[PDB]
Design an enzyme around this catalytic site. Sequence first.
Site, short mmCIF file in Angstrom:
data_model
loop_
_atom_site.label_atom_id
_atom_site.label_comp_id
_atom_site.label_asym_id
_atom_site.label_seq_id
_atom_site.Cartn_x
_atom_site.Cartn_y
_atom_site.Cartn_z
N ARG D 55 25.50 2.08 134.98
CA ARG D 55 26.75 2.81 134.82
C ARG D 55 26.64 3.91 133.77
O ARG D 55 26.97 5.07 134.04
CB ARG D 55 27.89 1.85 134.44
CG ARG D 55 28.14 0.72 135.42
CD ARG D 55 27.36 -0.54 135.06
NE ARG D 55 27.33 -0.79 133.62
CZ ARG D 55 28.27 -1.45 132.96
NH1 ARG D 55 29.33 -1.95 133.58
NH2 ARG D 55 28.14 -1.63 131.65
N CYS D 169 41.18 -32.66 131.26
CA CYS D 169 40.59 -33.80 131.96
C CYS D 169 39.83 -33.39 133.21
O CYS D 169 38.84 -34.04 133.56
CB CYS D 169 41.68 -34.81 132.32
SG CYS D 169 41.94 -36.10 131.07
N1 LIG Z 1 37.41 -4.15 120.37
C1 LIG Z 1 36.62 -4.19 121.46
N2 LIG Z 1 36.55 -5.30 122.23
C2 LIG Z 1 35.76 -5.35 123.32
N3 LIG Z 1 34.98 -4.33 123.73
C3 LIG Z 1 34.95 -3.16 123.05
C4 LIG Z 1 35.79 -3.03 121.85
N4 LIG Z 1 35.59 -1.79 121.37
C5 LIG Z 1 34.70 -1.19 122.19
N5 LIG Z 1 34.32 -1.99 123.20
C6 LIG Z 1 33.34 -1.59 124.22
O1 LIG Z 1 34.01 -0.99 125.31
C7 LIG Z 1 33.19 -1.16 126.51
C8 LIG Z 1 34.05 -1.67 127.64
O2 LIG Z 1 33.28 -2.38 128.60
P1 LIG Z 1 32.72 -1.65 129.90
O3 LIG Z 1 33.86 -0.80 130.40
O4 LIG Z 1 32.35 -2.79 130.82
O5 LIG Z 1 31.52 -0.89 129.40
C9 LIG Z 1 32.03 -2.08 126.12
O6 LIG Z 1 30.88 -1.29 125.85
C10 LIG Z 1 32.53 -2.72 124.82
O7 LIG Z 1 31.50 -3.15 123.95
#
Ligand SMILES: Nc1ncnc2c1ncn2[C@@H]1O[C@H](COP(=O)(O)O)[C@@H](O)[C@H]1O
Lengths: 77, 313, 159, 531
Positions: D55, D169
């Site tokens: 991605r 449970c």
């Molecule tokens: N507070 C946060 N909690 C969780 N993910 C976060 C946070 N801040 C930034 N991210 C990032 O935002 C991205 C969202 O996930 P994705 O869209 O699957 O890449 C990931 O790279 C996470 O590590």
Amino acid sequence: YIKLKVIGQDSSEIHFKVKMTTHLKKLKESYCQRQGVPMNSLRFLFEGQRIADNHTPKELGMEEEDVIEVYQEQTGG
Amino acid sequence: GGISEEEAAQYDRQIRLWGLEAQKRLRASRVLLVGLKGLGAEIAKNLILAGVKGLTMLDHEQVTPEDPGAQFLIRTGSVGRNRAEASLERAQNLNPMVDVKVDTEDIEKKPESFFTQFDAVCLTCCSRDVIVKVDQICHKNSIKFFTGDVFGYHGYTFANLGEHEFVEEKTKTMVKKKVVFCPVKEALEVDWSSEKAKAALKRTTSDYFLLQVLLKFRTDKGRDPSSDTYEEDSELLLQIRNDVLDSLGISPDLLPEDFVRYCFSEMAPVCAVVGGILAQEIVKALSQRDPPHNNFFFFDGMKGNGIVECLGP
Amino acid sequence: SHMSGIALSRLAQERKAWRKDHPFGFVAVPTKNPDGTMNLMNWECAIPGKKGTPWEGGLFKLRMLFKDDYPSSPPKCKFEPPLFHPNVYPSGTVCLSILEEDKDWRPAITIKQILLGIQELLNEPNIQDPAQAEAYTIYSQNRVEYEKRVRAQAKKFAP
Amino acid sequence: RGLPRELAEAVAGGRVLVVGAGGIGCELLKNLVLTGFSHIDLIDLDTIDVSNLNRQFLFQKKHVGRSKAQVAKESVLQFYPKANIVAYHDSIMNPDYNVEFFRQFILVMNALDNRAARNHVNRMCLAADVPLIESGTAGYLGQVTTIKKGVTECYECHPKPTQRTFPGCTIRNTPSEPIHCIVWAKYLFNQLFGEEDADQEVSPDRADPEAAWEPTEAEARARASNEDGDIKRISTKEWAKSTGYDPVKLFTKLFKDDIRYLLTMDKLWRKRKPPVPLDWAEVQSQGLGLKDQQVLDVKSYARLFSKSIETLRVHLAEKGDGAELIWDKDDPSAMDFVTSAANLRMHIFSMNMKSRFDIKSMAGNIIPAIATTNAVIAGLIVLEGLKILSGKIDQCRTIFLNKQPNPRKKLLVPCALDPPNPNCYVCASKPEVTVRLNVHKVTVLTLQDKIVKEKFAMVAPDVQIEDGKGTILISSEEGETEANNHKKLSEFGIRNGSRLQADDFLQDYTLLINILHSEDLGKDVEFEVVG
Ligand SMILES: Nc1ncnc2c1ncn2[C@@H]1O[C@H](COP(=O)(O)O)[C@@H](O)[C@H]1O
Ligand SMILES: [Zn+2]
């Protein structure tokens, strides 16, 4: 007795049988139970207009074998 | 099977979405991309990230001062270089296991044998005659044909897969379906003098006629509408709309007079959206999985609609 | 510990309602943080044994854990220390029908309702869904020893 | 640029915040840079993995292990040096990013993957009165919506689950689905190797090493031997540590003795298939796709369980001061342990064993993702932001991306933004007075009495630092929070920009107080309200 068709974003076609005068909250609850997801995340809209709990098919003028679109909100990306 | 451990590790997220078999089908497909502009750059990035066998980026034009300063694939200070040559380094850096090539020759001069090495041809910012010729060549040799463009807040996407066979998950699981497509000469010249045609026109989005008007504008002036010549281009666009919609026996009124305010220049978000849609269509066609959209897709940035239309049959 | 806004507002309203009027003998207070404040998502509860029952005279401490999904998800209740009961896991977790979202839990039901339900389950258990395999065993085999153990446990937990 | 001049100046001079630097975050950052945005703040807590290269395009194979935000900023600076990107390698939940931090952004864009961070960002944007664009993506689908205080619905107007919970449970007594066995394996991993947690203790505690059954027949001897509490129910983790984490005894306890323990409760096996315990000796002596997509036999999974147990024991021994392990789906040993344990439990309860691919998909909650969906969602996000910044909030809509066109021939379905829920309790308007005072020189008693009891006319107020964890500083109960009356306000994490909610019992009215630090106030007054 009016037959209703509910299709999700993945074209999951599920038929429903509802009454003319009953509210559509029962349909939303039944769909949420059947699909295993709470009705809060799902939104049901009729011809692009959101369906509220207090709405009835007579208010929206639903006819036999009609389509209801449901959109699940995604938590990801 | 033939997928290496590193390939699986870096493709896991899309493998979990569309199957190792479709990933392998993607891994053995070569795509030709013409017009490495913003839409072309987005399509190339998405296809290279998907993991096709190879991508031949074709562009005979050079980087000009009127182009945007930042282009996501052409490093700053590359004015005067070829677009494909400028973007080749970044495109190859996107995925090292994709054979990204560069062709600086004009698309018009390419012989028919040139297109046979690709199983998917994508056209961007090409004239209507070039689109028709390339689509005819692809249909003769059984090659998937795509074309798209972005203009202001509006974008469009066309696909001509011929007799397409694919597999789609059953509602309830792998079922086989067949869809027949139509050439550009039939999709862009659909007759509107029938009752069924009249009903379809009543149900047809106005973006099709906007696409026809802008294709005529590109055929006439040889270039897309430009912001620096807004008044003259807008007057010519209104005249072209009048003539084009009168030639088809249609009333220009359905295309709003203010359409000239949202069909100028190329926009990065519109480029991203249309390129994502078109690249997903190309991936679906190459992997022969999931039903590809109808021959036309239209996007409206201001209203937020993405409408898929079937025109030509 | 990061909870949602609706969960926090519901927990504050629940604490206010409990402090305004709660059944006699019952205790339900949010736990104390090491800093010195009190944690709304972690409650230290106490359930008294019903009078006229072998559990009478004892105060059974219970811990209430709320997650960010509250009230859409039930809290996780456990006895600290774990007690001897057919429907209480050896880890201390109490298995109740109303404490599970797919069986009986509804978001509109209150902390007082679930505490009273736990007390009722303590007074009388169900055997269709046991959770101990030892309390269940000596409940199904001979009730006299089960009542003796319950009385001894209640005496041990007498405040 | 094709933008109007006013919008061009608005996007050039404005400062925006992008939270999350994932695939959607990378596409959004690229689109914002290309559009004309110059001052962009990026925050992300994770590091580049090899699975992110499908991605994320700003990250390469040579960037694995580096910070996502810093690498994204460096990659953006490669094709556009003029961008003023500020990258934070931290969590958005950090207290440093208070309302004062959120108030300098003209627009905040969500690019997260969890509901908790979304809830926190929604709350912070609502507090700071900054428009927020919320987006999500899962496979071929996705959506983009706009959140504005007092105009549209916020993220908590219609609450959504953050994760799926399971009956206590059902997981440990009566599993019926492979997901139950998978979460049982995860809880078992936490119980054997992780920190203490009574809700993850899936293996019952008793006299472990001896293989015992028929407690119904020998109930007299059992009750004579054991008292109430059953000799304090020797902990499974302590017994496993004492035995040296040997795979054979652990296997016998977890898959033979625990199953026989389940079989003692004959009442709940009357309508379901009882589990069949596995003997280690019998399993040992009983005799295309990816390599992770192949389902092995029970013997291979038992051997994998033994190998994973040995490796995890070695890791625990090598860890300093015996620190508890934390389960990670990317750790080969933990993933092997969970796969083997879940498959063995499925075989015990007569269920189809699952390949490591599916076990990783369900245990780690992996969401399939592709570049095209993220690109489309990011483009829609930037379009919504352009609409917002030009005063066209009335034209903003909730746009849904479909995998296939709906019967109305719409691949993208825009829906009008709903008005806010009157009973949301999150976006509802509340009084928001603000006070400026010396944080390091004021006590909790002074805050309660001088500036809340009498300044704001509260008879029995209870105060609550709204840091998101629901911690309350002052309680109206006369014997609850008097121990920290003399403690300074800084000792509880209160600083400049911290806000604390205060509600009254008798007055039945609440109030939001904003804390502003000031060293120079004067010796006459220790606090001063700001109009
Ligand atoms: N507070 C946060 N909690 C969780 N993910 C976060 C946070 N801040 C930034 N991210 C990032 O935002 C991205 C969202 O996930 P994705 O869209 O699957 O890449 C990931 O790279 C996470 O590590
Ligand atoms: Zn709200």
